[PDB]
């Protein structure tokens, strides 16, 4: 797809869950660089 006219990205901002942070969309692969690769496990709540 293409970004909205005159824009380079979309900010998707949750307006109901006040603790949910934003999500972002770009439409050109050249607008992101994969800088860190993080290897992890999720931890079982104790």
């Amino acid at each position: 797809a293409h970004s909205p006219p005159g824009h380079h990205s979309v900010t998707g901002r949750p307006s109901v869950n006040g603790l949910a942070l934003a999500e972002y969309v770009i439409y050109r692969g050249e607008q992101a660089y994969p800088e860190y690769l993080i290897t992890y496990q999720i931890m079982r709540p104790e």
Binding site: T11, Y24, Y33
Partner: protein, 162 residues
């Protein structure tokens, strides 16, 4: 092309990135269905991704965007989870493979919440979970996220009902 440099846990850069991972975990309205049930991660490794051609492609576009947005690249650091993280670190992001079913159009998606990107490491909605145990909440199998430099430029603000 791509080289991966291991960061020492005693390095402030490692600790800084772990802090961004840990502090952006949130509860998800699916009760953990997609990404599993957890409040924190066990970080096993953090590697710097180095690729001169991909970095040059990125900074060239960043300069273009900057000049089109009152000299402001609007560059963020954001998370990306994907089953194809290995392809991404070697080939770069590719808009030919946008997320078609995203709420904000067919594009490349990133999150401020690490735990939102964690919902995509094993596939859309967690897929069928880890390949070994078929468990979206597996505590044993290793997961991988990318922490990415993202140029937003002039960003269209779309409020969502989430």
């Amino acid at each position: 092309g791509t080289i991966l440099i291991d960061l020492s846990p005693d390095d402030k850069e490692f600790q800084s990135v772990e802090e961004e991972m840990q502090s952006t975990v949130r509860e998800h309205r699916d009760g953990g269905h997609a990404g599993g049930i957890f409040n924190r991660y066990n970080i096993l490794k953090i590697q710097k991704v180095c690729n001169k051609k991909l970095w040059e492609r990125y900074t060239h576009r960043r300069k273009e965007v900057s000049e089109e947005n009152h000299n402001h690249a609007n560059e963020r650091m954001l998370f990306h989870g994907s089953p194809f993280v290995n392809a991404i670190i070697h080939k770069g992001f590719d808009e030919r493979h946008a997320y078609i079913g995203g709420m904000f159009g067919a594009g490349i998606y990133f999150a401020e919440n690490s735990s939102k990107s964690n919902q995509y490491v094993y596939g859309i909605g967690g897929g069928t979970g880890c390949p070994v145990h078929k468990d979206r909440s597996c505590y044993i199998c290793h997961r991988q996220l990318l922490f990415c430099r993202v140029t937003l430029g002039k960003s269209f603000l779309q409020f969502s009902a989430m």
